[PDB]
Amino acid sequence: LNPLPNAAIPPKYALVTVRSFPSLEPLTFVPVPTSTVAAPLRRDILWRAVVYENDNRRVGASNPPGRSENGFSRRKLMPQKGSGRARVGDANSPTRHNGGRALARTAPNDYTTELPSKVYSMAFNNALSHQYKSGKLFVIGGEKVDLISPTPELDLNRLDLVNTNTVEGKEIFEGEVIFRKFLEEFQLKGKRLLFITDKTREGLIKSSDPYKQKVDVIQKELVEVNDILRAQAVFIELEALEYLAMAHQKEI
Amino acid sequence: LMKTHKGTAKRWRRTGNTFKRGIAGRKHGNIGWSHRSLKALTGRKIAHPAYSKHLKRLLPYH
Amino acid sequence: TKFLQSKSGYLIPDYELTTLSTPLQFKRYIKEKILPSANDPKLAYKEAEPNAI
Amino acid sequence: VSILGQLKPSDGSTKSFKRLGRGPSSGLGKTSGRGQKGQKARGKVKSWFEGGQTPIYKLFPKIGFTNVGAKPLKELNLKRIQWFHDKNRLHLQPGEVLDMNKMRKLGLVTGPIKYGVKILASGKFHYNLPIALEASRASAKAIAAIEKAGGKFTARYYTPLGLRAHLNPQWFLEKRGRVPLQARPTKRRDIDFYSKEEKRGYLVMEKDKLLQDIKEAQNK
Amino acid sequence: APIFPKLEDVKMHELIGNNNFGKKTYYVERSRTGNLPVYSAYKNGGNKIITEIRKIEGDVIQLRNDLQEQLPFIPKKSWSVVMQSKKIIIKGNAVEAVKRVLTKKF
Amino acid sequence: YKQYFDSLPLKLKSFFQRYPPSIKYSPVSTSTKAINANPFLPNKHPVTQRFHDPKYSLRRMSDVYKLALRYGVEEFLPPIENTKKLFFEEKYNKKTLMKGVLLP
RNA sequence: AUAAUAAUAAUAUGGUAAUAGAACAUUUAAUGAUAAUAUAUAUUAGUUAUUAAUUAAUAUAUGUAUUAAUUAAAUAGAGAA
RNA sequence: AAGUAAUUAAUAUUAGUAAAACAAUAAGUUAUAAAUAAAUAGAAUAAUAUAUAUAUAUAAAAAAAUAUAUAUUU
RNA sequence: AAGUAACUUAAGGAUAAGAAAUCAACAGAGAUAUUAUGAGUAUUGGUGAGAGAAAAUAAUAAAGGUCUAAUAAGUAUUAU
Ligand SMILES: [Mg+2]
Ligand SMILES: [Mg+2]
Ligand SMILES: [Mg+2]
Ligand SMILES: [Mg+2]
Ligand SMILES: [Mg+2]
Ligand SMILES: [Mg+2]
Ligand SMILES: [Mg+2]
Ligand SMILES: [Mg+2]
Ligand SMILES: [Mg+2]
Ligand SMILES: [Mg+2]
Ligand SMILES: [Mg+2]
Ligand SMILES: [Mg+2]
Ligand SMILES: [Mg+2]
Ligand SMILES: [Mg+2]
Ligand SMILES: [Mg+2]
Ligand SMILES: [Mg+2]
Ligand SMILES: [Mg+2]
């Protein structure tokens, strides 16, 4: 009579607040799709993405000398019999203390693993969704979209500080100070930060440089799963977030 | 990379999830024997499961 | 929600905003999460030790 | 805390690799799974080394030849076309024929079409499409089913380059400002095949110039 | 066409935390080409056949129960729902029956 | 017009520079000393009486002709009649089928 | 319809070659509170069905664990040459 | 002080996608049809093999072998 | 195993190769070099051990074409 009574249609849009930068002020909501920003947190996929990325990152410079690589002569040290001691060949043997290593690696050691592109995209989405759930995904924008509340006088819609390069009075400069003030306000001085820009925000990275150990400014293209997850709070441009969504959307 | 054993490829051809082969003992000295009896040896033969693994290893791209 | 945030001093997360459909629900959420931490700073959630008791 | 310090693989994904030569209670102790003392214990004999007996790649006579002139067509069943049509994926305007390029575009045939497509008849009963088909060739039963449906098949010759051009004409235009011309069948066997009315070959069905020229030569 | 639509066109019921999708309800999304995600799988060297059902959103247990109710001919035991990826495995080649059951709603 | 000419591919442009269309070059083989000597044909040197190889070797000539065909600048190139190469549709139409094709 | 723990009844639990499953010590990489009332190493005596870790005392270092935990890997464990 | 690495092939388990997968520049590999040394051959004429496809054989069947069919293609 | 080790000789910042007496197949491409697919395919082997292309499509790549030759003879070709 009724075949699948509890069937229903899932929700498809999560609202993310569009903010002005220096002071994270709500300008508008923007409904990003549920697949990007509110996927079910699958850890296994996330793990796969992270390990793969780590493997890709590897330098692989381990270069211990094997018995060939090691630089002794090929001469037999003591004759096979009539020595009163154990049998020896050349001095390069792993068995002896100055000899080369057994089964020695040789740089460059390629540690590169592969991943399906779809899996990687899914993981990327998943990390973003997790970040959103945590309350660690600050979308900054308002240039393209139609606003509700107007942008402040001293803030701006993109992710950058004004007059950073200017430094006339003292050696100290204004963009750094603004950044420090911002950090003080939102209580994230020692916390890891991740600024996902769209285009190269030179002033922002200059402002950051004092807190280079914790703050990582990355482009929209070069951002990683690892970078997203390590971050204590990500600060993404609306346009950059749109681009990422487009990249890692499931195709139809 | 790995490569096919060319003699084995010449002897054996694929048949789904097995290999087919010709019969041995029908190249000379056939006269004197019964023709009906000999007709057993004319056709093809599927690989015996004993050497299936060996055949697979010989022919990696089959 | 913006007004509520401004008066409060605290930030209500985006996911929460999306979820909660009424002012009453928002109030209840606030009572649950922020209020006790505000009252007692030792009771507050720490990031490095998220599974604290 | 960040999730980055609490990620596991899915259950059943990973395993511990069997680690040899690392103590008795490990299981893979001193001998390290090798057994005891033979050639396989300390050295390498080949996996398929049969001992000295005439091996299974020697007893048996070598059979057949590799036809290098062969050009295997990819087979497309009528059933799959019907299924596509039912699904409303078989997008065709009225008059436009379902050619090999068109099939590729749609996703009827998928992967590389190197030599051509043959249309086979695995769902000839439920086939009811009046659209016109065109491929390298078709099965007789498949052809009959197409005719019954109110369709129209034509077996069309394509050299590998000509086929490629047919599949992707825009590429050639991009590169050279000109798609290449479709070749005539030079081979005798090919000419014979497309001259058959039973095969619905294009040379007889379209009444080609090449066939006429051949007839004139024969006469003279 | 636009990835993020404007604020006006999006309804309240379309958002997350509305219409109660989590509690005892589900969805089964079709594939890219537009077919029901139900597949035969030949495990343990073609010896173990099993029917897999993918792309399930929401409560999988409820969905499984509903499918069992629909198909009483399949036993109760042979319905393994793996929770990590949310897919429900059946013992036999019971693909066609499952598809028939699902089609009417999904 | 000048801009359109400039936009032409490099090889074709170079050819036009060094063998310009104002000179009506010969269809037939000529003296190597001649002004109207076709660069695609093998011209005979008058003293030695030895056929010099074409100034544009056959591949290069073919490429030039294909470029001209692409941009519709065929008639400004010197004639390729007595070079045995035909091209594209003209080649297709004018050719006789092989003896093997017509008479197996 | 699961997991953990605990009951009851039953059956099973010697093992070379071998096969299979599960852990621990060590070192590096990713994430990471804390602190001389702490941490590390050593000695002695307790504790937990115990290759391990923990408690206390004592000693020496250090204003401090790439620490607990999860992953990734290994020049990852020696009475036998 | 001793089962390591590279390039490959076959199995298995899981995860992604799924009549497609990987890749998206095209091209290719595997799958989607079974055969046959090979050839222009290739799966219900009205349903389970008693039908059909291929190889031997043939006018066409039968005969051996393997494969294909009983809202939804595997 | 291998035209490898080695010895010997000679050059340059690199050398080598290079603008088709090339490939292909009646359609066409249109220089040489390196890599990926093609492909462990064709091909070949006391048909054992084993050895193994090319076309075509992609990258990397630079402006990549351009005469300097009175157009080439003990040369092509043939036998061995
Ligand atoms: Mg790994
Ligand atoms: Mg007998
Ligand atoms: Mg043992
Ligand atoms: Mg013995
Ligand atoms: Mg021994
Ligand atoms: Mg042994
Ligand atoms: Mg035992
Ligand atoms: Mg060791
Ligand atoms: Mg020792
Ligand atoms: Mg011991
Ligand atoms: Mg016959
Ligand atoms: Mg040699
Ligand atoms: Mg040079
Ligand atoms: Mg060689
Ligand atoms: Mg010359
Ligand atoms: Mg000459
Ligand atoms: Mg000779």
mmCIF file of all heavy atoms in Angstrom, chain A residues 42, chain E residues 37 43 50-56 60 63 79-90, chain H residues 14-18:
data_model
loop_
_atom_site.group_PDB
_atom_site.id
_atom_site.type_symbol
_atom_site.label_atom_id
_atom_site.label_comp_id
_atom_site.label_asym_id
_atom_site.label_seq_id
_atom_site.Cartn_x
_atom_site.Cartn_y
_atom_site.Cartn_z
ATOM 1 N N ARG A 42 33.049 11.615 7.141
ATOM 2 C CA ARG A 42 33.706 10.333 6.902
ATOM 3 C C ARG A 42 35.201 10.477 7.170
ATOM 4 O O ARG A 42 35.911 11.148 6.418
ATOM 5 C CB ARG A 42 33.457 9.862 5.463
ATOM 6 C CG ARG A 42 31.981 9.643 5.172
ATOM 7 C CD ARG A 42 31.663 9.027 3.810
ATOM 8 N NE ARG A 42 32.566 7.976 3.326
ATOM 9 C CZ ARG A 42 32.812 6.800 3.911
ATOM 10 N NH1 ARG A 42 32.331 6.494 5.109
ATOM 11 N NH2 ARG A 42 33.537 5.890 3.267
ATOM 12 N N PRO E 37 21.290 2.774 -7.434
ATOM 13 C CA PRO E 37 22.584 2.263 -6.992
ATOM 14 C C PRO E 37 22.455 0.925 -6.255
ATOM 15 O O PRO E 37 22.561 0.866 -5.028
ATOM 16 C CB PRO E 37 23.084 3.379 -6.075
ATOM 17 C CG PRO E 37 21.837 3.879 -5.439
ATOM 18 C CD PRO E 37 20.784 3.810 -6.510
ATOM 19 N N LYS E 43 32.336 -11.802 -4.552
ATOM 20 C CA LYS E 43 33.448 -11.825 -3.601
ATOM 21 C C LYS E 43 34.014 -13.226 -3.375
ATOM 22 O O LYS E 43 33.380 -14.230 -3.709
ATOM 23 C CB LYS E 43 32.998 -11.230 -2.264
ATOM 24 C CG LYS E 43 32.624 -9.762 -2.350
ATOM 25 C CD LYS E 43 32.432 -9.153 -0.971
ATOM 26 C CE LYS E 43 32.270 -7.645 -1.054
ATOM 27 N NZ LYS E 43 32.023 -7.043 0.284
ATOM 28 N N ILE E 50 27.007 -11.212 -3.545
ATOM 29 C CA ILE E 50 26.264 -10.303 -2.649
ATOM 30 C C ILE E 50 25.707 -9.094 -3.407
ATOM 31 O O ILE E 50 26.320 -8.619 -4.366
ATOM 32 C CB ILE E 50 27.103 -9.786 -1.444
ATOM 33 C CG1 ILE E 50 28.391 -9.077 -1.896
ATOM 34 C CG2 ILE E 50 27.407 -10.899 -0.447
ATOM 35 C CD1 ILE E 50 28.331 -7.569 -1.766
ATOM 36 N N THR E 51 24.549 -8.605 -2.958
ATOM 37 C CA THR E 51 23.910 -7.410 -3.514
ATOM 38 C C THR E 51 24.198 -6.207 -2.619
ATOM 39 O O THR E 51 23.826 -6.208 -1.447
ATOM 40 C CB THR E 51 22.383 -7.593 -3.627
ATOM 41 O OG1 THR E 51 22.093 -8.671 -4.524
ATOM 42 C CG2 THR E 51 21.703 -6.318 -4.131
ATOM 43 N N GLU E 52 24.835 -5.185 -3.189
ATOM 44 C CA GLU E 52 25.203 -3.956 -2.478
ATOM 45 C C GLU E 52 24.253 -2.824 -2.873
ATOM 46 O O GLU E 52 23.857 -2.739 -4.034
ATOM 47 C CB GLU E 52 26.641 -3.584 -2.841
ATOM 48 C CG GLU E 52 27.240 -2.416 -2.068
ATOM 49 C CD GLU E 52 28.640 -2.060 -2.540
ATOM 50 O OE1 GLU E 52 29.446 -2.980 -2.800
ATOM 51 O OE2 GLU E 52 28.943 -0.853 -2.644
ATOM 52 N N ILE E 53 23.900 -1.966 -1.911
ATOM 53 C CA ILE E 53 23.043 -0.790 -2.154
ATOM 54 C C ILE E 53 23.763 0.472 -1.665
ATOM 55 O O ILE E 53 24.000 0.619 -0.467
ATOM 56 C CB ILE E 53 21.670 -0.909 -1.448
ATOM 57 C CG1 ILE E 53 20.947 -2.186 -1.896
ATOM 58 C CG2 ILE E 53 20.804 0.323 -1.732
ATOM 59 C CD1 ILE E 53 19.639 -2.473 -1.185
ATOM 60 N N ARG E 54 24.065 1.386 -2.588
ATOM 61 C CA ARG E 54 24.888 2.573 -2.302
ATOM 62 C C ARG E 54 24.096 3.883 -2.238
ATOM 63 O O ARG E 54 22.886 3.909 -2.463
ATOM 64 C CB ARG E 54 25.975 2.712 -3.370
ATOM 65 C CG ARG E 54 27.087 1.686 -3.282
ATOM 66 C CD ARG E 54 28.118 1.874 -4.389
ATOM 67 N NE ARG E 54 28.574 3.261 -4.551
ATOM 68 C CZ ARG E 54 28.121 4.145 -5.450
ATOM 69 N NH1 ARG E 54 27.162 3.841 -6.323
ATOM 70 N NH2 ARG E 54 28.638 5.371 -5.470
ATOM 71 N N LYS E 55 24.815 4.958 -1.903
ATOM 72 C CA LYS E 55 24.344 6.346 -2.033
ATOM 73 C C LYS E 55 23.134 6.651 -1.149
ATOM 74 O O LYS E 55 22.215 7.370 -1.556
ATOM 75 C CB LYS E 55 24.057 6.686 -3.504
ATOM 76 C CG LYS E 55 25.199 6.348 -4.453
ATOM 77 C CD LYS E 55 24.888 6.732 -5.891
ATOM 78 C CE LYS E 55 25.089 8.217 -6.157
ATOM 79 N NZ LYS E 55 26.520 8.630 -6.145
ATOM 80 N N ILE E 56 23.157 6.109 0.067
ATOM 81 C CA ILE E 56 22.066 6.270 1.019
ATOM 82 C C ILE E 56 22.357 7.475 1.906
ATOM 83 O O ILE E 56 23.442 7.580 2.485
ATOM 84 C CB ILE E 56 21.876 5.017 1.903
ATOM 85 C CG1 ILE E 56 21.675 3.765 1.035
ATOM 86 C CG2 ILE E 56 20.680 5.202 2.834
ATOM 87 C CD1 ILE E 56 21.966 2.466 1.754
ATOM 88 N N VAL E 60 19.947 4.526 7.656
ATOM 89 C CA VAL E 60 20.086 3.271 6.887
ATOM 90 C C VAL E 60 19.331 2.088 7.495
ATOM 91 O O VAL E 60 18.844 1.229 6.758
ATOM 92 C CB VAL E 60 21.564 2.837 6.657
ATOM 93 C CG1 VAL E 60 22.207 3.678 5.569
ATOM 94 C CG2 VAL E 60 22.399 2.862 7.936
ATOM 95 N N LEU E 63 15.659 2.221 6.456
ATOM 96 C CA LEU E 63 15.607 1.813 5.048
ATOM 97 C C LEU E 63 15.684 0.297 4.897
ATOM 98 O O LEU E 63 14.907 -0.297 4.150
ATOM 99 C CB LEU E 63 16.751 2.468 4.267
ATOM 100 C CG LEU E 63 16.999 2.038 2.815
ATOM 101 C CD1 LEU E 63 15.793 2.290 1.925
ATOM 102 C CD2 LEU E 63 18.216 2.766 2.275
ATOM 103 N N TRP E 79 21.051 -9.398 5.885
ATOM 104 C CA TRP E 79 20.930 -7.952 5.646
ATOM 105 C C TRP E 79 21.992 -7.215 6.466
ATOM 106 O O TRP E 79 21.699 -6.658 7.529
ATOM 107 C CB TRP E 79 19.529 -7.443 6.009
ATOM 108 C CG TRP E 79 18.451 -7.865 5.060
ATOM 109 C CD1 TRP E 79 17.782 -9.046 5.064
ATOM 110 C CD2 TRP E 79 17.912 -7.100 3.975
ATOM 111 N NE1 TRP E 79 16.858 -9.077 4.047
ATOM 112 C CE2 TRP E 79 16.916 -7.894 3.362
ATOM 113 C CE3 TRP E 79 18.173 -5.823 3.459
ATOM 114 C CZ2 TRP E 79 16.179 -7.453 2.256
ATOM 115 C CZ3 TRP E 79 17.439 -5.383 2.356
ATOM 116 C CH2 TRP E 79 16.454 -6.200 1.768
ATOM 117 N N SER E 80 23.223 -7.226 5.962
ATOM 118 C CA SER E 80 24.364 -6.629 6.654
ATOM 119 C C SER E 80 24.526 -5.161 6.261
ATOM 120 O O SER E 80 24.939 -4.865 5.138
ATOM 121 C CB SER E 80 25.644 -7.402 6.324
ATOM 122 O OG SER E 80 25.529 -8.763 6.699
ATOM 123 N N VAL E 81 24.204 -4.252 7.183
ATOM 124 C CA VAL E 81 24.344 -2.802 6.938
ATOM 125 C C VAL E 81 25.668 -2.295 7.518
ATOM 126 O O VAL E 81 25.802 -2.151 8.733
ATOM 127 C CB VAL E 81 23.127 -1.955 7.439
ATOM 128 C CG1 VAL E 81 22.650 -2.341 8.833
ATOM 129 C CG2 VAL E 81 23.438 -0.460 7.393
ATOM 130 N N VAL E 82 26.638 -2.023 6.643
ATOM 131 C CA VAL E 82 27.938 -1.496 7.081
ATOM 132 C C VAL E 82 27.782 0.008 7.344
ATOM 133 O O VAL E 82 27.390 0.770 6.457
ATOM 134 C CB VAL E 82 29.110 -1.835 6.110
ATOM 135 C CG1 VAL E 82 29.135 -3.328 5.801
ATOM 136 C CG2 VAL E 82 29.065 -1.026 4.820
ATOM 137 N N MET E 83 28.064 0.415 8.581
ATOM 138 C CA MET E 83 27.725 1.760 9.062
ATOM 139 C C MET E 83 28.718 2.854 8.678
ATOM 140 O O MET E 83 28.331 4.023 8.606
ATOM 141 C CB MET E 83 27.553 1.757 10.589
ATOM 142 C CG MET E 83 26.328 1.008 11.098
ATOM 143 S SD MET E 83 24.739 1.535 10.417
ATOM 144 C CE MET E 83 24.822 3.316 10.592
ATOM 145 N N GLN E 84 29.982 2.493 8.449
ATOM 146 C CA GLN E 84 31.011 3.488 8.121
ATOM 147 C C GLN E 84 30.712 4.211 6.806
ATOM 148 O O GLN E 84 30.737 5.441 6.766
ATOM 149 C CB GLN E 84 32.428 2.876 8.128
ATOM 150 C CG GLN E 84 32.751 1.882 7.016
ATOM 151 C CD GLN E 84 34.081 1.172 7.222
ATOM 152 O OE1 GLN E 84 34.976 1.685 7.895
ATOM 153 N NE2 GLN E 84 34.217 -0.015 6.634
ATOM 154 N N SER E 85 30.394 3.452 5.756
ATOM 155 C CA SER E 85 30.069 4.007 4.434
ATOM 156 C C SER E 85 28.560 4.098 4.159
ATOM 157 O O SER E 85 28.159 4.671 3.144
ATOM 158 C CB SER E 85 30.751 3.177 3.340
ATOM 159 O OG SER E 85 30.443 1.801 3.474
ATOM 160 N N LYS E 86 27.741 3.554 5.064
ATOM 161 C CA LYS E 86 26.278 3.502 4.918
ATOM 162 C C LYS E 86 25.846 2.840 3.608
ATOM 163 O O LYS E 86 25.415 3.506 2.659
ATOM 164 C CB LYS E 86 25.640 4.893 5.094
ATOM 165 C CG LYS E 86 25.471 5.315 6.547
ATOM 166 C CD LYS E 86 24.503 6.479 6.699
ATOM 167 C CE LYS E 86 25.014 7.740 6.021
ATOM 168 N NZ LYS E 86 24.228 8.937 6.426
ATOM 169 N N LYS E 87 26.000 1.521 3.570
ATOM 170 C CA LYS E 87 25.485 0.692 2.483
ATOM 171 C C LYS E 87 25.021 -0.642 3.049
ATOM 172 O O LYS E 87 25.611 -1.156 4.001
ATOM 173 C CB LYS E 87 26.537 0.491 1.389
ATOM 174 C CG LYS E 87 27.860 -0.087 1.860
ATOM 175 C CD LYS E 87 28.845 -0.244 0.715
ATOM 176 C CE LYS E 87 29.357 1.095 0.208
ATOM 177 N NZ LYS E 87 30.546 0.934 -0.672
ATOM 178 N N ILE E 88 23.970 -1.197 2.451
ATOM 179 C CA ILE E 88 23.297 -2.377 2.999
ATOM 180 C C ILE E 88 23.468 -3.577 2.056
ATOM 181 O O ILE E 88 22.999 -3.565 0.915
ATOM 182 C CB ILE E 88 21.827 -2.066 3.398
ATOM 183 C CG1 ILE E 88 20.945 -1.771 2.185
ATOM 184 C CG2 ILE E 88 21.802 -0.870 4.339
ATOM 185 C CD1 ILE E 88 19.565 -1.242 2.511
ATOM 186 N N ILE E 89 24.180 -4.591 2.547
ATOM 187 C CA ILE E 89 24.567 -5.759 1.761
ATOM 188 C C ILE E 89 23.573 -6.896 2.006
ATOM 189 O O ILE E 89 23.185 -7.154 3.147
ATOM 190 C CB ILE E 89 26.012 -6.216 2.097
ATOM 191 C CG1 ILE E 89 27.035 -5.159 1.646
ATOM 192 C CG2 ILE E 89 26.346 -7.540 1.417
ATOM 193 C CD1 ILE E 89 27.168 -3.959 2.558
ATOM 194 N N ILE E 90 23.178 -7.564 0.922
ATOM 195 C CA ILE E 90 22.262 -8.709 0.958
ATOM 196 C C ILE E 90 23.015 -9.912 0.378
ATOM 197 O O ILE E 90 23.882 -9.745 -0.482
ATOM 198 C CB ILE E 90 20.972 -8.430 0.144
ATOM 199 C CG1 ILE E 90 20.345 -7.082 0.541
ATOM 200 C CG2 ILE E 90 19.947 -9.543 0.338
ATOM 201 C CD1 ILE E 90 19.410 -6.506 -0.500
ATOM 202 P P U H 14 35.302 -6.502 1.916
ATOM 203 O OP1 U H 14 34.157 -6.871 2.786
ATOM 204 O OP2 U H 14 35.283 -6.889 0.480
ATOM 205 O "O5'" U H 14 35.506 -4.927 2.032
ATOM 206 C "C5'" U H 14 35.511 -4.295 3.324
ATOM 207 C "C4'" U H 14 36.502 -3.155 3.381
ATOM 208 O "O4'" U H 14 37.773 -3.524 2.777
ATOM 209 C "C3'" U H 14 36.116 -1.883 2.650
ATOM 210 O "O3'" U H 14 35.137 -1.167 3.398
ATOM 211 C "C2'" U H 14 37.468 -1.195 2.538
ATOM 212 O "O2'" U H 14 37.898 -0.606 3.748
ATOM 213 C "C1'" U H 14 38.364 -2.380 2.169
ATOM 214 N N1 U H 14 38.490 -2.622 0.720
ATOM 215 C C2 U H 14 39.192 -1.699 -0.042
ATOM 216 O O2 U H 14 39.697 -0.695 0.432
ATOM 217 N N3 U H 14 39.265 -1.993 -1.383
ATOM 218 C C4 U H 14 38.731 -3.094 -2.026
ATOM 219 O O4 U H 14 38.877 -3.218 -3.240
ATOM 220 C C5 U H 14 38.029 -4.000 -1.170
ATOM 221 C C6 U H 14 37.932 -3.740 0.137
ATOM 222 P P A H 15 33.828 -0.581 2.678
ATOM 223 O OP1 A H 15 32.859 -0.198 3.735
ATOM 224 O OP2 A H 15 33.409 -1.530 1.613
ATOM 225 O "O5'" A H 15 34.365 0.758 2.004
ATOM 226 C "C5'" A H 15 34.893 1.820 2.819
ATOM 227 C "C4'" A H 15 35.728 2.769 1.992
ATOM 228 O "O4'" A H 15 36.915 2.095 1.496
ATOM 229 C "C3'" A H 15 35.077 3.333 0.735
ATOM 230 O "O3'" A H 15 34.169 4.390 1.033
ATOM 231 C "C2'" A H 15 36.295 3.767 -0.065
ATOM 232 O "O2'" A H 15 36.848 5.000 0.349
ATOM 233 C "C1'" A H 15 37.257 2.612 0.219
ATOM 234 N N9 A H 15 37.152 1.533 -0.764
ATOM 235 C C8 A H 15 36.574 0.295 -0.622
ATOM 236 N N7 A H 15 36.646 -0.448 -1.700
ATOM 237 C C5 A H 15 37.303 0.359 -2.617
ATOM 238 C C6 A H 15 37.685 0.155 -3.955
ATOM 239 N N6 A H 15 37.449 -0.974 -4.628
ATOM 240 N N1 A H 15 38.325 1.163 -4.586
ATOM 241 C C2 A H 15 38.557 2.298 -3.912
ATOM 242 N N3 A H 15 38.252 2.608 -2.653
ATOM 243 C C4 A H 15 37.618 1.584 -2.054
ATOM 244 P P G H 16 32.834 4.582 0.163
ATOM 245 O OP1 G H 16 31.981 5.586 0.851
ATOM 246 O OP2 G H 16 32.276 3.240 -0.147
ATOM 247 O "O5'" G H 16 33.376 5.234 -1.184
ATOM 248 C "C5'" G H 16 33.748 6.620 -1.219
ATOM 249 C "C4'" G H 16 34.430 6.956 -2.520
ATOM 250 O "O4'" G H 16 35.497 6.009 -2.792
ATOM 251 C "C3'" G H 16 33.565 6.882 -3.766
ATOM 252 O "O3'" G H 16 32.692 8.002 -3.873
ATOM 253 C "C2'" G H 16 34.625 6.792 -4.855
ATOM 254 O "O2'" G H 16 35.206 8.033 -5.201
ATOM 255 C "C1'" G H 16 35.648 5.864 -4.195
ATOM 256 N N9 G H 16 35.450 4.465 -4.555
ATOM 257 C C8 G H 16 34.954 3.445 -3.779
ATOM 258 N N7 G H 16 34.890 2.305 -4.412
ATOM 259 C C5 G H 16 35.370 2.591 -5.682
ATOM 260 C C6 G H 16 35.542 1.750 -6.814
ATOM 261 O O6 G H 16 35.269 0.548 -6.932
ATOM 262 N N1 G H 16 36.038 2.456 -7.906
ATOM 263 C C2 G H 16 36.363 3.791 -7.900
ATOM 264 N N2 G H 16 36.844 4.289 -9.048
ATOM 265 N N3 G H 16 36.208 4.584 -6.854
ATOM 266 C C4 G H 16 35.713 3.921 -5.787
ATOM 267 P P U H 17 31.120 7.785 -4.131
ATOM 268 O OP1 U H 17 30.444 9.098 -3.978
ATOM 269 O OP2 U H 17 30.666 6.628 -3.318
ATOM 270 O "O5'" U H 17 31.064 7.394 -5.674
ATOM 271 C "C5'" U H 17 31.459 8.348 -6.675
ATOM 272 C "C4'" U H 17 31.780 7.669 -7.986
ATOM 273 O "O4'" U H 17 32.896 6.745 -7.836
ATOM 274 C "C3'" U H 17 30.696 6.802 -8.599
ATOM 275 O "O3'" U H 17 29.637 7.540 -9.201
ATOM 276 C "C2'" U H 17 31.515 6.002 -9.598
ATOM 277 O "O2'" U H 17 31.852 6.770 -10.735
ATOM 278 C "C1'" U H 17 32.747 5.668 -8.755
ATOM 279 N N1 U H 17 32.584 4.410 -8.004
ATOM 280 C C2 U H 17 32.689 3.223 -8.710
ATOM 281 O O2 U H 17 32.927 3.181 -9.905
ATOM 282 N N3 U H 17 32.502 2.087 -7.963
ATOM 283 C C4 U H 17 32.219 2.013 -6.613
ATOM 284 O O4 U H 17 32.077 0.912 -6.080
ATOM 285 C C5 U H 17 32.116 3.280 -5.956
ATOM 286 C C6 U H 17 32.292 4.407 -6.656
ATOM 287 P P A H 18 28.152 6.936 -9.219
ATOM 288 O OP1 A H 18 27.306 7.822 -10.058
ATOM 289 O OP2 A H 18 27.751 6.654 -7.816
ATOM 290 O "O5'" A H 18 28.337 5.548 -9.980
ATOM 291 C "C5'" A H 18 28.579 5.531 -11.398
ATOM 292 C "C4'" A H 18 28.855 4.130 -11.889
ATOM 293 O "O4'" A H 18 29.857 3.479 -11.066
ATOM 294 C "C3'" A H 18 27.687 3.155 -11.861
ATOM 295 O "O3'" A H 18 26.815 3.406 -12.959
ATOM 296 C "C2'" A H 18 28.411 1.817 -11.960
ATOM 297 O "O2'" A H 18 28.755 1.472 -13.286
ATOM 298 C "C1'" A H 18 29.662 2.075 -11.114
ATOM 299 N N9 A H 18 29.546 1.567 -9.746
ATOM 300 C C8 A H 18 29.366 2.268 -8.578
ATOM 301 N N7 A H 18 29.286 1.507 -7.513
ATOM 302 C C5 A H 18 29.422 0.220 -8.011
ATOM 303 C C6 A H 18 29.426 -1.042 -7.388
ATOM 304 N N6 A H 18 29.286 -1.222 -6.073
ATOM 305 N N1 A H 18 29.579 -2.131 -8.175
ATOM 306 C C2 A H 18 29.720 -1.953 -9.496
ATOM 307 N N3 A H 18 29.734 -0.820 -10.196
ATOM 308 C C4 A H 18 29.581 0.242 -9.385
#
